[PDB]
Each structure stands twice: as C-alpha cells, then as structure tokens.
Amino acid sequence: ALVLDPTGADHHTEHRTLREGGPATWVDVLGVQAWSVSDPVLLKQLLTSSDVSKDARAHWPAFGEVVGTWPLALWVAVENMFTAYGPNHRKLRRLVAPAFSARRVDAMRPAVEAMVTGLVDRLAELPAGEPVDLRQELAYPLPIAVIGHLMGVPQDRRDGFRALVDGVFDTTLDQAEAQANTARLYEVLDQLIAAKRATPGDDMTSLLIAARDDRLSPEELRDTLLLMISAGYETTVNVIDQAVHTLLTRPDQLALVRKGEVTWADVVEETLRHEPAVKHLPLRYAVTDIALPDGRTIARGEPILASYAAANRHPDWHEDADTFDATRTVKEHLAFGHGVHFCLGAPLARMEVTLALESLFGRFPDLRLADPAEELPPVPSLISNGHQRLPVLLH
C-alpha cells in the first residue's frame, strides 16, 4: 500500500503520485489500508451508490479492532449524520438541515457581513508597516464568530474549542495523543450542553438538546454537536487562507476581479477546486463487492477514501487542471463532496469566504505578502489543506 504522509508536507506531489495509480490506489492512512479514489467520475458513482456506506458499525468488519488503535478513530466512531447510512442518515441530517437552508443563509447575510466588517475594521487599527498573520486575525476568527452565533456558543466558551478542533485534524498525533484530545473535546462539549440546558436560546444547540430531551440519543446529541462545532472552527479557515494566498501570488486573478471579468464567487469556486480545504475524506466502506475500471475489485467490507483534492485536478475533468483560473467555464469540483452527504455548511462557507474577500481587498487594495520569498509551510495534516501562517502587509 502507498503510505500517505501524515504531515501533509507536499500534497501537490501527492496528487500526482496517487493519480499515477489510475482511478484508484490501495493506500495506507495511519495504519489503515483503503482504496483512495481520485477519478471524479468513479468517485461520484461511489458517492451515490447504495453499495457504499459511511456506517462503519454496520458495514466495516474491522471497525471493532480498529477503533482502539487507529489515531483517526473519531472520524468513524461518532454517531451522527457523518457516519449514518440510508434512512438513518436522512433522519440525522434533516434535524440540522433547516439551519442551513437557502432562506436561512440569506437571512444571516447581514449578521455575517457585520462580523466581517468588524474583523476587517480591527485590521485597519493595527500598527501600519508591521506584518499581520491574516490566518490568525481574519481566517480563524470569522468562522468561529459565525458558528458561535448559529450554534449559540456562549462567548466565554468559544476559545476552549480552538486547540481541540485543531487536534481533530492533526494527523501527526499518535493513538494516545488523539484519544486525549478527543476526551478533552467531549468534556467541553458536555459542559456546553449543560450550560445550554440551563440557559437555552434561539439556536441549533438548544434545538438539538430539545430533540434529545424529548428521537436523539445522548451520543447522537454530543456527536452531532462535535461535528457542527468542529466544522465551523476549522476548514473554512483554509478556504479563506488559500483564496487570499492565491490572489496575493497570482495578481492576474485579482485584476480579473477588479476588471469585472470574474466575481468573488468565481474566485471562491476556483479556490475550492484548486486548493480545497479537505484533501481526503475518511471513510467509506463497500456494502458489497464493487468492480473497479481496471477489473480489480473493492471487496465487501474494504474501506474507500475519497481523495477530493487530487480528483479536482484530474486531467479528464479539467484542462490545465493544475493552473488556477477563475475564468473557467466549467467550475465543478468535489471540495464539498457529492450526493446525500454533500457538505451541509456549503452555502454558509461560500458566503463567509466571498464576503471576507470583498471586505478585505475592498479595504486594503494594496494588500500583499509580508515577504514573497518566504516559504509558508503547510498545516501538518493529511486532511487539512492550508498554510501554518499567512504574513501580510495591509498598506
């Protein structure tokens, strides 16, 4: 099996290495072997087939053995829509879906714009001439403010999730370290639940608690909250990171926006295709034997790893796929998945990034990297795709 680098040191080379194996390749993900699939046609078929599942408990025979030794166990051990199959998935997703409907996201625009303006205004107060780490001053705080408002996370409890959600995506942690991070996360989650139970509000956390106190099990409640909070605290940060970094390293693209040839939305869509926030998605399983394009077989019970980043650059899908081009007529990508599990937060994330870009470049037209010659290393993760820091000069 091809061993995927847990430190995510060079994902671009990784894309090529994986695609070198054809539509699918047997790989090793921190000790677990699975079929990495990067052919978008095949991936879309697998993602819409009744023969593929995200329910490890029901469809992965090795689950019982893996759960105690795999550092990424939390990704497949939770009990929420992320690990549900069929009717159970429809049920667990429908409970949260309402908060992310088209009408709801549109209704949140004013609040999100205000949050964006506040963070950008703050940047404007920073000492002129001194470098600013945009990842820490804008990319990270915006998604947190949005999810906090939507989920109803008390202000005094927001910082507590930061290091823990980071741990969820830290694929360099060993089993013991991952287990400790997970325990700490459930602890702050239980505390949040207790606080919201005592003082409910007009938010999703309160609605979920209400559903559990009515069905919804104790595990489904905390695990659904874990999913929603983690999704809001990480991932979007990387899209903002990548979009800004691209515009600062590819001036022609920013000029296209200023000329009115492409929109901020177009830039976000190309960023999602070219440098998606989630490179690989653990994990799926074959409910029955599945034939691969080369005659090989994904045996019943074997894992399937959706390799979205590599797939978004597949040469039969997009021409000159490795080049960032916001003018592309065909903008489809798999950054949010495909099918019933399609990212529930997609519309909100898209709005967050488009608004952030507009406000940021609108306020600082001379924004630029603090040091273009400085190499910005990637976040140490096989899953998350972002820079450890994004040093810029506002004026």
Ligand code: HEM
């Ligand atoms: C507003 C912030 C976000 C929220 C609340 C959110 C929420 C969710 C939820 C609830 C799911 C599970 C859906 C299901 O299994 O039915 C999900 C899945 C997913 N999300 Fe997000 N998400 C957010 C941002 C993002 C971003 C920025 C990306 C990457 C550009 C992303 C990528 C994905 C992917 C790849 C999946 C899995 C698709 C699959 O099942 O293969 N999400 N998200």
Ligand SMILES: c1ccc(-c2cnc[nH]2)cc1
């Ligand atoms: C665990 C599983 C999924 C997620 C996620 C979904 N969308 C963004 N992050 C975060 C933690």
